[PDB]
Amino acid sequence: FNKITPNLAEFAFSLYRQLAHQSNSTNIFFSPVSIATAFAMLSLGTKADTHDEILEGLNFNLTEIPEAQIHEGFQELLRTLNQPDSQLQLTTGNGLFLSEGLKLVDKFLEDVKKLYHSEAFTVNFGDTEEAKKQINDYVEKGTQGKIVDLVKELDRDTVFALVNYIFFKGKWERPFEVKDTEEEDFHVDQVTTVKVPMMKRLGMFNIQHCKKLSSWVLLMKYLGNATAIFFLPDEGKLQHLENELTHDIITKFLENEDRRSASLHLPKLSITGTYDLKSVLGQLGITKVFSNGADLSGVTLSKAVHKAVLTIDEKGTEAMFLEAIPMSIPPEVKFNKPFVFLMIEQNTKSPLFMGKVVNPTQ
């Protein structure tokens, strides 16, 4: 469906809203599914408030959905995410990292393997530099070399760590031509611009202006089972757009199939988001696991980090179809000022990644 997609969606927006206010001035990029998957998997060895906070903090109402059905949700999500169509690359994995002489509840062990398909590794936390090396190695491998250094610090007492990675690589169903990419202005401010390489294409797009959001809404399909949604707010309407996004509205857009002519300008870019999940998630009512009272007892971990990297370009491949373009003048739709976007997996409809581009050359 997925049973938990609505929740993941709402989590993505809560978490986004928190990142946006404040910094207010920084590119934003994160994977809502990576964060929620790691903490749903963690919650499984917690109890009492510590536990409840986590699931509530993930936008699951506990007086509403059976806790078991959540984890079956995540189990089915993960299964699905790891069966991409052959023209799409999509992988996710969870890793557990354990001290040699650490007392582990067998139940917790078998839950994460079954529900979260987790791998498990013994490491020597006695050698802090080397344990980090081994953790960051799992990620480097999962991420095909792109992330060499997720974890930069490890408290001396730690005997346990949990990692989720997701790797996505996609090709546009209807790509841009490299010949047409040219340097244009990007309006970081109402009065300030920077130069960015700007892709463009005249084509028939699933594009519309939505009054409820005061934004243009563009859906771009990848070959295989995924879509990107881009949102361009009307002048002075970014905040309104940020405040009015809901699962229901996005679901509607996904259902729309009409195409119309537009001259689309979209920046070629790379952005990265790096987050300290303590301050950020504590702002969403997940404080206990970070503190002493932490009921870490269903297992037998204070620091939490998230890093996400985006790259967008013309095709997605060094490696045909024809659109009927009407006479009428096409609207010029330029993603040349701050915008929001969402990446959605098709089968699950889950929010793989979400972000905001304030300045592509930041």
Partner: peptide
């Protein structure tokens, strides 16, 4: 890329 999430680590706890």
């Amino acid at each position: 890329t999430t680590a706890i």
